[PDB]
Amino acid sequence: KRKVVLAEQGSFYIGGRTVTGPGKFDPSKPVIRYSNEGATFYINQMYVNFQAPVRPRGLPLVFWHGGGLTGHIWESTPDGRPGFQTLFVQDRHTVYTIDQPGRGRGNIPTFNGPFGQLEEESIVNTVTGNSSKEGAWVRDRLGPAPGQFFENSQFPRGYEDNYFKEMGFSPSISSDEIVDAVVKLVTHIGPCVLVTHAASGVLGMRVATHAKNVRGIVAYEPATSIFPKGKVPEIPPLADKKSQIFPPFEIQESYFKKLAKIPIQFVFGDNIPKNPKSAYWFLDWWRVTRYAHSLSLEAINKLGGQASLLDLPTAGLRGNTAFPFTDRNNVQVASLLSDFLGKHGLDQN
Amino acid sequence: KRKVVLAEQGSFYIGGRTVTGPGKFDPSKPVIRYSNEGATFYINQMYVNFQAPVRPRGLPLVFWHGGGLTGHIWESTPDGRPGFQTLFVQDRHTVYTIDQPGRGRGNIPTFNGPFGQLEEESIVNTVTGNSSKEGAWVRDRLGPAPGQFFENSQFPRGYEDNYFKEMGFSPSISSDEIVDAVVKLVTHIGPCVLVTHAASGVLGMRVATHAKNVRGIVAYEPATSIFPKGKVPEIPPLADKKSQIFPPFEIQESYFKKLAKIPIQFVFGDNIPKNPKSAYWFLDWWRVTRYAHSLSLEAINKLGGQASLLDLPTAGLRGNTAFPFTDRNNVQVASLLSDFLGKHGLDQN
Numbered sequence A, B: 001k002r003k004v005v006l007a008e009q010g011s012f013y014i015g016g017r018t019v020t021g022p023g024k025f026d027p028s029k030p031v032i033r034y035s036n037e038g039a040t041f042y043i044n045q046m047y048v049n050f051q052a053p054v055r056p057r058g059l060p061l062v063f064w065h066g067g068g069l070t071g072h073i074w075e076s077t078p079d080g081r082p083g084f085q086t087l088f089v090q091d092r093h094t095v096y097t098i099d100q101p102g103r104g105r106g107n108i109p110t111f112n113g114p115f116g117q118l119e120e121e122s123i124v125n126t127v128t129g130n131s132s133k134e135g136a137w138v139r140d141r142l143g144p145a146p147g148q149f150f151e152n153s154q155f156p157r158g159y160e161d162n163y164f165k166e167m168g169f170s171p172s173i174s175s176d177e178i179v180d181a182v183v184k185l186v187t188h189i190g191p192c193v194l195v196t197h198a199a200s201g202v203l204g205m206r207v208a209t210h211a212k213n214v215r216g217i218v219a220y221e222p223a224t225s226i227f228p229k230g231k232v233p234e235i236p237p238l239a240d241k242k243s244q245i246f247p248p249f250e251i252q253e254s255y256f257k258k259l260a261k262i263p264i265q266f267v268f269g270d271n272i273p274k275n276p277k278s279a280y281w282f283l284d285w286w287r288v289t290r291y292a293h294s295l296s297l298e299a300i301n302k303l304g305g306q307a308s309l310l311d312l313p314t315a316g317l318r319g320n321t322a323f324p325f326t327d328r329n330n331v332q333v334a335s336l337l338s339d340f341l342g343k344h345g346l347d348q349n
């Protein structure tokens, strides 16, 4: 289960831009100084790792971590079992894993001065936000409240510290610049499949509308829905009658229609309530978010698309959290991803 | 050359602590708030990646990136050639690569509020520092000034964008907590060899004094020298008559003496001047820093140690920058590391 034969592996940086400070650089003066003087900074670049099997079959897969995460989530589970990177190299696909701009090995754009500030220019905000352990517990549906598990949970219990340690903040890089980096990667790779998660769901949909090389999308528990501009359907508030899900992203119809040209599957785990749940905000949020996604997929299919929603319990998999690819049954989740790739000819040369 | 066979690979988090905000978490209230209310945060943890060959021989190697870097520098060179991770798995060692706390996939400790601030506590400073491309160019001895290359340079010229994109800022995490994370890793792995670089040089020396499982150290271009407390020798200022090298780190003699029990090699590349160089601050800084290291190694050897300084040009390798393990001749640099491991039996079971 653990062995991997790689024809090659490596990593590289792609995308980003530069910004410059005032003045000029003098090599005779002391170089280590609290100064942006004469300085060029590379910002907003992305880190990319690849592992290629011997005799690859089908298209390369690009695994794109969710919000506050890194490519670690595709390498191993919190309890140390193989992640989708190993499983899909064994399945004879070349596997790319990224750390998007602002996360992990991607660039965090800060300089000499208050965080994110280059002289009088704010590149990213000095004030950050970040989830807590308690917030992530309920966001990821480990259970209804921090420290409590659903009876059926597939989470690797006992490895809570390892799991939460993988999460962190993201600086306020524009989503446009994150999408731009991945479009550039897709141009470099050629035809490929995006496998996204949570926050990267909407971003991968956007990439596909800018990059014909994206030949398929599988999105685990996408966090933000997408619709044609001016065609957002009625979406109810949450059960508290005060809160809303994330405002759906709206794109020009000419771009939205490109989503009808490739197979797209959204995958949801377990324990999303069918009925309003005012006592558990994030459970209710997932109910309405999943509903919004069902309408988004319906809109793609009304344009001639092939967009599907897979609820893992309907496939016989019970208890999955919002990270099904690191849960205890992740091999069975991977099997369902292999099935999708195979049906759509994405595992053939 | 590119093929690699792994018995297993993976990644995990280790080390760190938790800090908490005020109050209690309520799962019925909107979870996504600009608030540290009832929040627990994991901070200062380290990311660790491992790749194990089939039938390893000798001790595992722990590659520890320099300042502002990540484990990427051991994965691949800027022009995409195999890094030391691949080369040493091929050489039958299990290889660990880390992103230390504050860098890459390691934790950046920030919350809801100004960067680094958890309510009234400053976990790390809101004001950051960061090198520029121009500063790094001269720091790493690509040439005497930005845009210029030393004759016979082994830098992968043409891949400057890739190279500089791998560098970034570090938040003000205490060095004690960075050392602590690696001590914990060394306890987890067992007997091992540390391979350090620039800023991580002094940190690896510190780890060895706290961790008997460190059985050898190879340090590329270490940035800060280390001496027994009260026993720092006279070190001259730089040629500009005003600047100094980094204040040497001082440790109690009982800990310093632990450095005499293991083989230690410091490795330097090319173009460090033998004579004062007022016009090029960082070249002169390297001259005096290397001198200080020569005295540190002598101090270890006078306590019965096995410490040595390897100047790559004396071994027949010309043109190396301060990242010799990513230069064009990195295979030959790796061969010298294999030689060190073999001399001391660190490549035998």
Ligand SMILES: COC(=O)c1ccccc1S(=O)(=O)NC(=O)Nc1nc(C)nc(OC)n1
Pocket: A066, A067, A068, A069, A129, A130, A131, A132, A135, A136, A139, A197, A198, A199, A200, A223, B031, B032, B033, B034, B035, B112
């Ligand atoms: C991996 O999960 C997602 O991708 C994900 C999944 C669902 C919603 C949102 C995200 S997120 O990551 O973009 N953003 C996020 O979680 N932010 C956040 N911020 C605060 C301040 N508190 C909390 O509490 C949960 N969350």
Ligand SMILES: COC(=O)c1ccccc1S(=O)(=O)NC(=O)Nc1nc(C)nc(OC)n1
Pocket: A031, A032, A033, A034, A035, A112, B066, B067, B068, B069, B129, B130, B131, B132, B135, B136, B139, B197, B198, B199, B200, B223
């Ligand atoms: C990888 O190199 C080292 O490890 C390394 C090598 C030699 C010295 C220092 C470092 S460092 O990385 O700890 N710190 C550093 O470089 N800081 C810095 N800060 C500013 C503000 N400007 C510049 O200009 C160079 N440098």
Ligand SMILES: COC(=O)c1ccccc1S(=O)(=O)NC(=O)Nc1nc(C)nc(OC)n1
Pocket: B148, B149, B150, B151, B152, B153
């Ligand atoms: C690393 O060295 C330098 O950086 C370096 C150092 C000094 C001069 C030039 C270079 S160079 O690399 O930019 N370019 C170079 O050498 N060009 C060159 N072109 C021809 C056509 N013939 C010869 O030499 C006969 N040289």
